[PDB]
Amino acid sequence: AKSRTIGIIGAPFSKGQPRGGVEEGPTVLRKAGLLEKLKEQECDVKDYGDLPFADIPNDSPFQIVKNPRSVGKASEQLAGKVAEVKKNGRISLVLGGDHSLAIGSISGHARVHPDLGVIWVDAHTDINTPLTTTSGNLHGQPVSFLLKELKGKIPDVPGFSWVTPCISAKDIVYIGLRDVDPGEHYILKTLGIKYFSMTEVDRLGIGKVMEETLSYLLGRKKRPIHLSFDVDGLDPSFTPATGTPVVGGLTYREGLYITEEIYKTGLLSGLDIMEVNPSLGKTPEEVTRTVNTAVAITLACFGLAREGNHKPIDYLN
Amino acid sequence: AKSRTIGIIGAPFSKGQPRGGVEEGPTVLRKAGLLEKLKEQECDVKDYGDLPFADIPNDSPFQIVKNPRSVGKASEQLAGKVAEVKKNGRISLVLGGDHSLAIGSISGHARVHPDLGVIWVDAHTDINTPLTTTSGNLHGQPVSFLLKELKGKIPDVPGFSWVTPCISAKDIVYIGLRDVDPGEHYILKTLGIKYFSMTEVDRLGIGKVMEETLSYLLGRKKRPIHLSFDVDGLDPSFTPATGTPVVGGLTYREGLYITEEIYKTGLLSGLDIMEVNPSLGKTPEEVTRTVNTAVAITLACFGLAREGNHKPIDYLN
Amino acid sequence: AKSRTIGIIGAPFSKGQPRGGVEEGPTVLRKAGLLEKLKEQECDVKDYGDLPFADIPNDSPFQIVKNPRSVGKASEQLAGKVAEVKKNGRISLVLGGDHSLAIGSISGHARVHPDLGVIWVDAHTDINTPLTTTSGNLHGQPVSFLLKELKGKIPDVPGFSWVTPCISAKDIVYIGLRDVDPGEHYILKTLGIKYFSMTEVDRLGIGKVMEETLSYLLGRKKRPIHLSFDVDGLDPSFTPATGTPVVGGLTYREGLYITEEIYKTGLLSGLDIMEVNPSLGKTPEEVTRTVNTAVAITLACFGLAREGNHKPIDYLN
Ligand SMILES: N[C@H]1CN[C@H](C(=O)O)[C@@H]1CCC[B-](O)(O)O
Ligand SMILES: N[C@H]1CN[C@H](C(=O)O)[C@@H]1CCC[B-](O)(O)O
Ligand SMILES: N[C@H]1CN[C@H](C(=O)O)[C@@H]1CCC[B-](O)(O)O
Ligand SMILES: [Mn+2]
Ligand SMILES: [Mn+2]
Ligand SMILES: [Mn+2]
Ligand SMILES: [Mn+2]
Ligand SMILES: [Mn+2]
Ligand SMILES: [Mn+2]
């Protein structure tokens, strides 16, 4: 089935942020048996392997922006790989790797499906520009590079000349926001982007959040869905092995609900599983908890339901 | 009052599953002060003791089905004990023991009140038949033995010739589901059983879940309610000393809400507190946490309200 | 701005309850950087200091009521300090200290704003009278001293002759109740006080809870809001270093939701942050978790939003 035909892309890349270990995310998600688990769920899985990201020595900052050429090149390569998977009629499944890789993942997905609408699950908006950033970490900026409305607000950053903004402010929905920088809040409000911060989740419940998200993106006409999932979108009691944990996040149940609802549209076309950092657990159990939650999230995207699943056969015979 | 008149039955039985210790459930719930706590809540409590379950040596399997004669006999004896408590005008309170004991609890209760509706609080449906089961553990099959629509799908299992299905698929509501076998999902869907898996709980909220459950069972006419509570229905952060724990369960609040709402009907007629296994805690605190949550759930069933309680006297005099 | 103009009052007082350490609540909230954090959020903060509470030797009980003169005097002094802050056109921010101090905090606030409405966030009603109390702890009685409908039910307690009931039963809404004494439940029902015990929160969701609370208090016309927040209203998994912890409380998210909603009215006029006890943590982390949650609560009251905040400047220039 279309909704269960997958192309796995490993993106072992960490230079969009300063914490070592996020490059081990594809390895640990594979070691947990993600591919096997998906195959046991009637998925047609093709593994495109782990992208080689050749070292760029002397990758000096663009102002405060760290490793621009490396981040630019990794996303550029990933865009080509995602476009190939999309041309092969498969849902692209990007195993990260820091969230700067979403530049390549969506850009690549938008080359084959330009009418796509994004669902961004994160505690963070990742919408800082190279000029509003105070950290210079590119995993906090991918959305600014992708938005058509911010063309003219993005300076010429080395490694990013290949980037053409592929999404309008109306084609993205945020879910799980709770750590937004002033520049980002300003951008979010002046561009009128649709979002459900934890405040809206608390007000409405995840049921109405999903009803509104899917209606806002798909109401007019069915279109492909790109879900960019930052594991820090979920509460640190579920995904603690991550770079930027923020308290009061989405529960394990809320995460499964989001992904179950997306599955049920039959329109998932791209998926990013990001910011899993296996060297950031306080104990080895914190690492396995994060990886297991990330696996459970991914499996929900491709049909795994809490009410159960069965094959189209008579089990009472 | 009818809703606070109780007959306690201990069912120290473990052979419906492979993990030792669940037979200690009645002991540990009693030691926690359950009887005394109920009496402090204006309950008329009579203790019918712990059933003796005389050893059946040479209880060889029926195909893959383990200890069929022992499970069959324990349920058969429990049905007789429950029918006696029901004849004595008391709400039967079965302290388990594994969930295969629900065969006897509900069969026994249905002898006195054949019009009863069942609320099944669990992470599992427990509706495998002796032919769909892959484990052969009878705690995973009690509902299949009880359903009238499955008559002809249940083979002649040694120890179960006394069983006559007493409930129709429309007389049961499941709450908390999150671990359903394929055969069970097939049965659940083809029989059109009403259920609220974690997915529906997430979508609707526990408020609407309870409104729908009580309307669905009591809308046509008021009838007696049998609540079969498996402690694994709740999240393992609340009930960890249990055999088959599954992440993402019902919260402590959701468990208290379900039982509050049932109490308020004035129609609770039978209660099962099952799967408490005091030898399955990782620490002694995990055991006391489980037992305390089970006690709290029980007290809500017999009137303990979070808003408070008061006697019909003038407290300001 | 009115909603961000604050007068800080430290109330290091513990004699309304028997557990030592709650007098250290103002110290630990200050050490966490509360004042500085408020100033970084565009608040105009004036610090009125920590009240000196002189020892009252020979403070004999009034029946079972412990330290009546000390509790009466601390509240009396606090009422004078709150009235001063209110006359200076600032929102009074009381850092406690036990909940007995709410006698002084609301009485003082009502002298300047007699039309105020009270939101009481707590696991408890604190509405026991000196005659319904079984513990004799005055932090479990402040509402009874304040209610006009209970005039004639409050005996002449030494230290409280200065007290004039300033609020009617219709001017108070409780949120998070789950541990109510019989006498308190009787008072709550016979006076017809509006409340959302954890049962109503579970039923309605915090969104509807807040909608109803604000409509019930502000419906007729805008009036000043007094939020008396007891950190035990929140679940002990968020605020464990407190005297009277009760399981199944409001979540970190729900607490922030209540305070974000109150901020948005622009009508917060009085705030109490009570029952933080830094000597009641099991680990040093339990203390920092409680203090951090209490800081987050206070900050949402003065504008800190989870969707983010920005200054009225062009961030894209
Ligand atoms: N503290 C946040 C908000 N802004 C910061 C930045 O701009 O560097 C961090 C970005 C998180 C990226 B993430 O969502 O992929 O984790
Ligand atoms: N993992 C579940 C689903 N089905 C399995 C089986 O058929 O043996 C397990 C039974 C649990 C019993 B219980 O609900 O009483 O806890
Ligand atoms: N268990 C409660 C209810 N009544 C008791 C009392 O009257 O002393 C306890 C007081 C807690 C007050 B507090 O909310 O300020 O913590
Ligand atoms: Mn991100
Ligand atoms: Mn993030
Ligand atoms: Mn069960
Ligand atoms: Mn179960
Ligand atoms: Mn209080
Ligand atoms: Mn309290």
Dump the DSSP string for B104-136. HHHHHHHHH-TT-EEEEESSS-----TTT-SS-
Catalytic residues of C: 99, 122, 124, 126, 139, 230, 232, 275
- In whole angstroms, what is the distance from residue A142 CA to residue A106 CA? 10
Element holding A10 (H helix, E strand): strand A5-10
C317 carries a ligand binding annotation: no
- In whole angstroms, what is the distance from residue A196 CA to residue A119 CA? 11
- In whole angstroms, what is the distance from residue C116 CA to residue C4 CA? 18
Best of B132, B202, B209, B246 to substitute, by most chain A Cβ atoms within 10 angstroms, is B202
Binding residues of A: 99, 122, 124-128, 135-137, 181, 230, 232, 244, 275
- Closest in B308, B311, B316 to C153, CB measured: B316
Tell me whether residue B56 is exposed, middle or buried, using C-beta atoms within 10 angstroms of its C-beta: 0 to 12, 13 to 18, 19 or more: middle
**What would the two tokens of residue A108 be?**
């690549």
What is the residue with the minimal CA distance to atom 8 of ligand 1?
Answer: A140
Experimental approach: X-ray
Touching subunits of B (3+ CB pairs, under 8 Å) are: A, C
- Closest in B207, B253, B310 to C204, CB measured: B207
C310 to chain A: closest CA residue: A182
The answer to whether the CB atoms of B189 and A310 lie below 8 A apart is yes
- In whole angstroms, what is the distance from residue A99 CA to residue A95 CA? 10
Atom from ligand 1 closest to the CA of residue A232: 16
C197 carries a ligand binding annotation: no
| Sheet containing B91-96, strands listed edge to edge, beginning at the edge strand earlier in sequence | B44-50, B5-11, B91-96, B268-274, B225-230, B117-121, B172-177, B194-197
Alpha-carbon gap: C300 to the closest alpha carbon of chain A (Å): 11
Give the bridge partners for C44, in sequence order: C5
Taking the Cβ of residue B221 and every Cβ of chain C, the question of whether any pair is shorter than 8 Å is answered with: no
Show me where the domains of chain A are located. 1-317
Q: How many CB pairs under 8 A join B and C?
A: 74
- In whole angstroms, what is the distance from residue C281 CA to residue C297 CA? 19
Best of C263, C306, C311, C317 to substitute, by most chain A Cβ atoms within 10 angstroms, is C306
Task: Please report, for residues A80, A84, A105, A266, A273, the alpha-carbon distance to residue A2 in angstroms, rounded to integers and kept in the order given.
Answer: 21, 16, 19, 8, 20
**What would the two tokens of residue A187 be?**
């951008």
The answer to whether the CB atoms of B186 and A260 lie below 8 A apart is no
- In whole angstroms, what is the distance from residue B194 CA to residue B192 CA? 6
Tell me whether residue B286 is exposed, middle or buried, using C-beta atoms within 10 angstroms of its C-beta: 0 to 12, 13 to 18, 19 or more: middle
**What would the two tokens of residue B230 be?**
């498996």
Q: Among B113, B102, B109, B46, which Cα is nearest to B82's?
A: B109
Best of B131, B151, B203, B208 to substitute, by most chain A Cβ atoms within 10 angstroms, is B203
What is the residue with the minimal CA distance to atom 6 of ligand 2?
Answer: B140
Pocket of ligand 3 (CB under 6 A): C 99, 122, 124, 126, 128, 133, 135, 137, 139-140, 179, 181, 230, 232, 243-244, 275
Measured in Å, residue A226 CA sits from the centre of ligand 5 at 17
Alpha-carbon gap: C298 to the closest alpha carbon of chain B (Å): 25
Tell me if A66 CB under 6 Å of ligand 1: no
Where do the DSSP E strands lie in A59-144?
91-95, 117-121
> Which ranges of A88-197 would DSSP assign to H, the alpha helix?
102-112, 142-146, 182-190
What is the residue with the minimal CA distance to atom 6 of ligand 1?
Answer: A140
Task: Report the sign of the C-alpha dihedral through residues C28, C33, C36, C38, in that order.
Answer: negative
Q: In C, residues 153-192, which contact B (CB 8 Å cutoff)? A: 153, 177-190
What would you report as the CA-atom Rg of chain B, rounded to the nearest whole angstrom? 18
Active site residue A179: no
Give chain C's length.
317
Q: Among B172, B265, B261, B268, which Cα is nearest to B210's?
A: B261
Query: Cis bond leading into C21, ω under 30°?
Result: no
- In whole angstroms, what is the distance from residue A97 CA to residue C185 CA? 55
Catalytic residues of B: 99, 122, 124, 126, 139, 230, 232, 275
Alpha-carbon gap: C242 to the closest alpha carbon of chain A (Å): 20
- In whole angstroms, what is the distance from residue B125 CA to residue B140 CA? 8
Residues of C within 8 A of A180 (CB-CB) are 306-309
CB A166 within 8 A of CB A104: no
The answer to whether the CB atoms of A306 and B205 lie below 8 A apart is no
Task: Please report, for residues C256, C261, C263, the alpha-carbon distance to residue A178 in angstroms, rounded to integers and kept in the order given.
Answer: 11, 15, 17
Q: In A, residues 32-51, which contact C (CB 8 Å cutoff)? A: none
